[PDB]
Amino acid sequence: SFDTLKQFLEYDRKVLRFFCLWDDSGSLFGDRRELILHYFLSDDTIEIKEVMPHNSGRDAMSLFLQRRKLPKYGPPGVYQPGQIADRTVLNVYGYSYLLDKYKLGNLDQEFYKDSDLSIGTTINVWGRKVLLCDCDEFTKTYYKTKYGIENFTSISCK
Amino acid sequence: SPYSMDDRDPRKFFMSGFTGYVPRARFLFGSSFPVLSNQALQEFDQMKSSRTYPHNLGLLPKYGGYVPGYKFQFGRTYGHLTHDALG
Amino acid sequence: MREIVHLQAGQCGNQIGAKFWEVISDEHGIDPTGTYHGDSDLQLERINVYYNEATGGKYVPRAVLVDLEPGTMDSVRSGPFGQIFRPDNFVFGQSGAGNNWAKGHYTEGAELVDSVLDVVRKEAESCDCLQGFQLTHSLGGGTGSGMGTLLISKIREEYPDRIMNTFSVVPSPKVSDTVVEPYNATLSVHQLVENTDETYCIDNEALYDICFRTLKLTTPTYGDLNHLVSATMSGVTTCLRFPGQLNADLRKLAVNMVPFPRLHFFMPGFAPLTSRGSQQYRALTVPELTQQMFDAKNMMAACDPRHGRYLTVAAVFRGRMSMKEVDEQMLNVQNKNSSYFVEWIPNNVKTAVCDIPPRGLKMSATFIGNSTAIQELFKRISEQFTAMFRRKAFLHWYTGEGMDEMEFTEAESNMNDLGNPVVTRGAC
Amino acid sequence: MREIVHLQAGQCGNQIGAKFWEVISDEHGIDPTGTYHGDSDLQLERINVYYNEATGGKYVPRAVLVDLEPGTMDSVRSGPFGQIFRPDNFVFGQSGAGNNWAKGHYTEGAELVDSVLDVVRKEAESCDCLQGFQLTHSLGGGTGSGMGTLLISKIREEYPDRIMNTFSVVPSPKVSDTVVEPYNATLSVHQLVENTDETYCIDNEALYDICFRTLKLTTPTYGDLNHLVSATMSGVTTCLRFPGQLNADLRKLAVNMVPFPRLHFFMPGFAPLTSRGSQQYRALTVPELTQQMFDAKNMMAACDPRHGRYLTVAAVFRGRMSMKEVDEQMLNVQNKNSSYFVEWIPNNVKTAVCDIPPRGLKMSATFIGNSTAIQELFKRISEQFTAMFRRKAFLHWYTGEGMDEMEFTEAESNMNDLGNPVVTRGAC
Amino acid sequence: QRECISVHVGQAGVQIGNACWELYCLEHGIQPDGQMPSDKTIGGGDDSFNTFFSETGAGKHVPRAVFVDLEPTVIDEVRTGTYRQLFHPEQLITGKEDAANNYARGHYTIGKELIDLVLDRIRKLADQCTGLQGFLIFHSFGGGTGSGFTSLLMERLSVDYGKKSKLEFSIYPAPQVSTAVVEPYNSILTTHTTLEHSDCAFMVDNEAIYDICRRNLDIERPTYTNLNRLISQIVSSITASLRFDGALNVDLTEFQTNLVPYPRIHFPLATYAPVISAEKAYHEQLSVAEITNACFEPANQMVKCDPRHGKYMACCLLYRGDVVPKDVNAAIAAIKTKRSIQFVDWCPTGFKVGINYQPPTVVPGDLAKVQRAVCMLSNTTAIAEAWARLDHKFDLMYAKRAFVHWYVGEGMEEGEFSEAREDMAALEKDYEEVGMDSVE
Numbered sequence A: 001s002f003d004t005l006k007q008f009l010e011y012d013r014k015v016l017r018f019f020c021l022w023d024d025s026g027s028l029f030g031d032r033r034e035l036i037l038h039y040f041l042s043d044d045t046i047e048i049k050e051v052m053p054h055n056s057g058r059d060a061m062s063l064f065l066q067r068r069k070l071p072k073y074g075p076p077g078v079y080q081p082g083q084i085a086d087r088t089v090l091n092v093y094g095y096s097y098l099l100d101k102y103k104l105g106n107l108d109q110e111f112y113k114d115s116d117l118s119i120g121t122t123i124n125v126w127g128r129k130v131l132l133c134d135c136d137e138f139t140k141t142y143y144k145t146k147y148g149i150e151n152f153t154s155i156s157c158k
Numbered sequence B: 001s002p003y004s005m006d007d008r009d010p011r012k013f014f015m016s017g018f019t020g021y022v023p024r025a026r027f028l029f030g031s032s033f034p035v036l037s038n039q040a041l042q043e044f045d046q047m048k049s050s051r052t053y054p055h056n057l058g059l060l061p062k063y064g065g066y067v068p069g070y071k072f073q074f075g076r077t078y079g080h081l082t083h084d085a086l087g
Numbered sequence C, D: 001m002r003e004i005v006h007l008q009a010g011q012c013g014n015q016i017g018a019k020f021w022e023v024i025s026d027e028h029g030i031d032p033t034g035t036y037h038g039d040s041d042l043q044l045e046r047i048n049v050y051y052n053e054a055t056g057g058k059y060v061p062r063a064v065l066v067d068l069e070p071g072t073m074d075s076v077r078s079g080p081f082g083q084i085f086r087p088d089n090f091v092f093g094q095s096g097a098g099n100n101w102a103k104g105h106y107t108e109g110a111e112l113v114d115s116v117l118d119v120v121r122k123e124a125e126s127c128d129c130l131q132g133f134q135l136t137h138s139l140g141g142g143t144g145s146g147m148g149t150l151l152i153s154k155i156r157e158e159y160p161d162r163i164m165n166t167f168s169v170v171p172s173p174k175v176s177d178t179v180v181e182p183y184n185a186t187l188s189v190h191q192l193v194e195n196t197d198e199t200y201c202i203d204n205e206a207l208y209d210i211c212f213r214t215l216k217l218t219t220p221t222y223g224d225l226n227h228l229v230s231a232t233m234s235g236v237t238t239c240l241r242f243p244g245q246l247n248a249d250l251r252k253l254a255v256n257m258v259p260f261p262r263l264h265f266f267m268p269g270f271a272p273l274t275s276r277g278s279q280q281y282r283a284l285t286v287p288e289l290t291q292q293m294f295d296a297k298n299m300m301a302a303c304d305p306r307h308g309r310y311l312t313v314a315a316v317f318r319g320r321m322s323m324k325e326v327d328e329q330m331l332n333v334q335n336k337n338s339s340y341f342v343e344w345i346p347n348n349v350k351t352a353v354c355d356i357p358p359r360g361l362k363m364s365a366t367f368i369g370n371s372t373a374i375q376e377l378f379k380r381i382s383e384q385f386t387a388m389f390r391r392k393a394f395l396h397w398y399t400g401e402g403m404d405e406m407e408f409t410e411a412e413s414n415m416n417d418l419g420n421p422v423v424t425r426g427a428c
Numbered sequence E: 001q002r003e004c005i006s007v008h009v010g011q012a013g014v015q016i017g018n019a020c021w022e023l024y025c026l027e028h029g030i031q032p033d034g035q036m037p038s039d040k041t042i043g044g045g046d047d048s049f050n051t052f053f054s055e056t057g058a059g060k061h062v063p064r065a066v067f068v069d070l071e072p073t074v075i076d077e078v079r080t081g082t083y084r085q086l087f088h089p090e091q092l093i094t095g096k097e098d099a100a101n102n103y104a105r106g107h108y109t110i111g112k113e114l115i116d117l118v119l120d121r122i123r124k125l126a127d128q129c130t131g132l133q134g135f136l137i138f139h140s141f142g143g144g145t146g147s148g149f150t151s152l153l154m155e156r157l158s159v160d161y162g163k164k165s166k167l168e169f170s171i172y173p174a175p176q177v178s179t180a181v182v183e184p185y186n187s188i189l190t191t192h193t194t195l196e197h198s199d200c201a202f203m204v205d206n207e208a209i210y211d212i213c214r215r216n217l218d219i220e221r222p223t224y225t226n227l228n229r230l231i232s233q234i235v236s237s238i239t240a241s242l243r244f245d246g247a248l249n250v251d252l253t254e255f256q257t258n259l260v261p262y263p264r265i266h267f268p269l270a271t272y273a274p275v276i277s278a279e280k281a282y283h284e285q286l287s288v289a290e291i292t293n294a295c296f297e298p299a300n301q302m303v304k305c306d307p308r309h310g311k312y313m314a315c316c317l318l319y320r321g322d323v324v325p326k327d328v329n330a331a332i333a334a335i336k337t338k339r340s341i342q343f344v345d346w347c348p349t350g351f352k353v354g355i356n357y358q359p360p361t362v363v364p365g366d367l368a369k370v371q372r373a374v375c376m377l378s379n380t381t382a383i384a385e386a387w388a389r390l391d392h393k394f395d396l397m398y399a400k401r402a403f404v405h406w407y408v409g410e411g412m413e414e415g416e417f418s419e420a421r422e423d424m425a426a427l428e429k430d431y432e433e434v435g436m437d438s439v440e
Ligand SMILES: Nc1nc2c(ncn2[C@@H]2O[C@H](COP(=O)(O)OP(=O)(O)OP(=O)(O)O)[C@@H](O)[C@H]2O)c(=O)[nH]1
Pocket: C245, C246, C247, C248, C249, C252, E010, E011, E012, E013, E015, E016, E071, E098, E099, E100, E101, E102, E140, E141, E142, E143, E144, E145, E146, E147, E171, E172, E173, E178, E179, E180, E206, E224, E225, E227, E228
């Protein structure tokens, strides 16, 4: 499965909007935060933003994460160059490619999907833990359509 | 840095001059590196990864301060009067 | 306490910085939420070299992020190990130096350098022995150069005695993006030679070959082209961060790798570099390291090091090794490749040795060499100058922003006087 | 310590070398993943004659795989012992040879042997005391004759003092898998006469003969054929991988088996070759080992030894066996057959035994004969060449590539000039 | 009574100091913590430690060396490691910016911020010393903190303690292989200033250590720890007669009085006897005659200079262990008849033989349990070849203005290079009229 048109046409402009709650009461000088997850199924990416009130404190801090994938087993160490790349290459000609069939090495990369992010779970986005508290109507439609669970009673943040 | 043998063992003092960092130490001020480095490393572990009411009554004659209620307390002596600060 | 201060001006530089900052945070076990979560002593001992502490192990990165347009600002901010760069250390702008050295320098940029040299001082004051400055500034393009060079000149003024290793991405003809690289970049050299002291020039082109003919990556993303450069950096200041024998510092290198005061344009290099499909077949021993750190592939610049002999090369090995082999492999390198080293500098290869390897390896060897072939590297940018300068094209948008054809002549004058000393020593 | 560099060229040479590495891996106790799971510590004693060590016991062969199409490479990796080969010496190429010697030697082969020479230079430099090379190829057909001769010429030019085995599969008369076998063989032997110190001829008809008349197989496949060739391929070089008395290395065999400088083409043979139905009825010992050895049934080249005198012959025995039991029978062979051995060379038998035999067998041996019956093969290639050449048939590819009518007649003269000495030494 | 002060300057000095001090700790009973063990004892009773080790009340013993280095982290590993309790906290003098492999940064700019403290501690250590026997300076002829700081320390010690003997344990940079590029500059600029402030310079070369470890120790891959331990055995055996007792005890004034003929010619060569490596040590007869031949063999010499290309001047042999004196009398008689070792005509007797009744101790690791040793310290003419091989490098670098600005702009002046080369010409000159035969 190394194609993009499948996801890019099944879920082109479909976004999973999750309201969440970051807990940083245990931080020394910190405080709890309001994170909004947007999972894009077209490229299996997670962006998360911070929604912040009037006369806030912290700046207009853009988004919190950006449009890439998310490593699910905590914060992993970045590796030496050319480890978590695409399909393994044996040699070059003499611009060229071979597609080695015996893939072995740093291919073991475990990442969130729509299955591992459901209402009521705590996700460890790069260290910190943030709990999923509510979702949108399109998300409710999608999770009734595919996985069949209803159970959409929200867990209200603070 | 935390090579103080950890736990509560004696070892915890980085020899004077140890140019090494003692995570959470310069943010403290008071005594000598030895006992500092000790408390300095301990700091990490924490999370790592009037007063006269009782027997001590009297308040001391002429005490500079206002014992709550003194203004309107006509009785025995500063001693007896201040035998219950937070009464 | 030897602290270092790293500048982050320019889209390119800001990105190389983030990946650089990741690696150094990924060696001192700094978590993308601040608190250190590593499990080694030698990690914290020297956190003063890059991460100032705070209330609650928040080791905030001593960084100075600057951009005339809040683009890479947010980009880096919303990044992975990027929600830690102090909010104040993030000086922003409201415009953008659309590829124009004039803008970056004698204009907008200038009216912000004050609001940039302001924080840098706060930093300097926060330090104890600022071992020097390290600027990730694309000589090419706007911001990067214009602003950077201005700060470079300015910083020196404040603290004269100091080191200045500029990791800069010189354009390599082959591939080009902005159509003003000749002009915009040309300028840098002038304000570099007379203010730099350890130029580590990198070339997107070269790094691409090193992401195809050495790592075999079908789709070499700029991200990887960053780690290769990022590594070189967190590999040079190794001694001032971890124990070991022959601890060579950011100064030692400059006092054994700079013959004449101006002859200081060096090229980079990282050793343990193989493909994802050969990690288990390769033998990471000393000989191998040398048989790659001394070729024309691991060098992250574009100037066949075999066109012109080198004057002074050095290497920072980092891992439990035996000086004997280090010394031999290097002495042998000379006797073997003897037509590629000046005969006016006996003993021309410095060999340091740390006592901590990079996380996920067992040995490492950053390469730094004052090659003479860098002559070509600059020759091309000058060879280009003319074309655009001849017909004074792409100049209206440059001279009408506080500039004069005069500057061009003087900048080129230096390019000639930089590609001049080389051919001289070319033959001792 | 002595090391052999194995290069394999062409589809035939690649498959034979893959089966050879499977045989050696099962002999030296290495699983397809590359680790060591053996039974005896002596089995690892001299592993680095064929295997370069990697980290964690991931021993990989010192082998350069070369072909002009990336299909034989994909097949060799798709074989069972595929996780054993280094991807760096895995030199493929996107082209089509077309079974053309001109396209193997004067065309894209000549553009890819630069990379082949670079990687074999690296493997030869990573050695302690290199003794020689092992090129597995086919004498007839493309690549192995076109690229193979060019590779041998460059290897000999860069190393002129080392023993150079070329294990070459020669054409057969009764069947032909390629129309231009005479052209390709005549062009290849012109080089293979004056470069290689010794060359091992394999005729594919004799493999069929030894599979039906001796092994009693029903449908002999290429796996079985290249396995049987790999048996003697391994059996030649065993005194350097395992101990024993009368250890004879490659140059010892070269000295005792090359009387005159141009006469080095040999005939191999392996003789615990038992059919499954008749093996438990065999009394396997040195007597019938020698009897099965010296017959005209186990010869792997279709040249009948009764049609010519033996110049010299070596036997590499393997197993715990007794010395006069070898000696009385190796004198009895000459004393019985006196019209098949030369008189001007008295006592033309080399004996070399080894301690550990191959697995499952109690004793093995390898026949190496330098007969005067090779004139049959070379003269037969000569008239089969001249019949095709007198009409200039199938020649327009070679002539239009850049060759001429001139260069073929010296190859045919060299055919005749090896035909004369191997006949006049049989005629004394 | 007989106390010696060691000043370890430069990183090579500090690491060789760690080696020689761990050797002293495991040669006596002095633990890494500092208390001699309760339920153990060693040998020399209650006075033999009053050498390099110092006595304090209730038993906590202290060394009397001064570890000085203008950079941290290499002091930090020595202090943080396995000898954290032994050393006095202020005897470890740290710089703050690295001396940058520069004579000027060792001698004229960062030379004042710490030499007041270093001399202050030298005064305090000389206060607790009944007889100040001598100063041994452990340093390299390479980087800035080993060249410039040593060179700056020499004239202040010559001013304050002019009557005391001072000697050098030197890391000369190798004539073949080398590790830094301004080694010739730094070596000449430090030996110019230390020529008049050094009474004897024992010299050690890393390539010689390397191939001795290859050949005799059977290590095909040694490290700086293995080098400095073999240097440490030399140091401990030279300074042994003040520690213990024997037949002929060699004083540190006897070293200068027997080994330096002329006041300028004070550059001998150390070498060690058996450097055998355990798994091949018990196979050998290990005789006094054969170790006396082995030290004069031109392969165990601890600098890379050929002894056949010159004449010896004065050889000092220090034996340790069960050495019968008449074995060394027969050994010297065997030496004086071989023509491969040529002598000058003006030194008929030149062998200072001293015997100490104690065998070498063994650090857990490389060296073998041998009940014998001798260090051979010979003044030869062959060091002129090393001076020539380094002065050729200096001339070839000086001819075209290499690296001069880092020196001159930071405290040095342009002349000091030229008169340092003039002094090298004078020393290489004097080594020829001392070596020429008498014709008058
Ligand atoms: N035995 C031993 N010798 C060393 C060691 N380190 C360096 N050397 C020798 O010293 C030479 C260079 O090291 P130094 O001269 O001490 O460098 P430095 O004096 O510390 O210079 P800075 O970096 O400025 O502090 C090398 O060529 C070695 O010969 C060591 O750890 N042990």
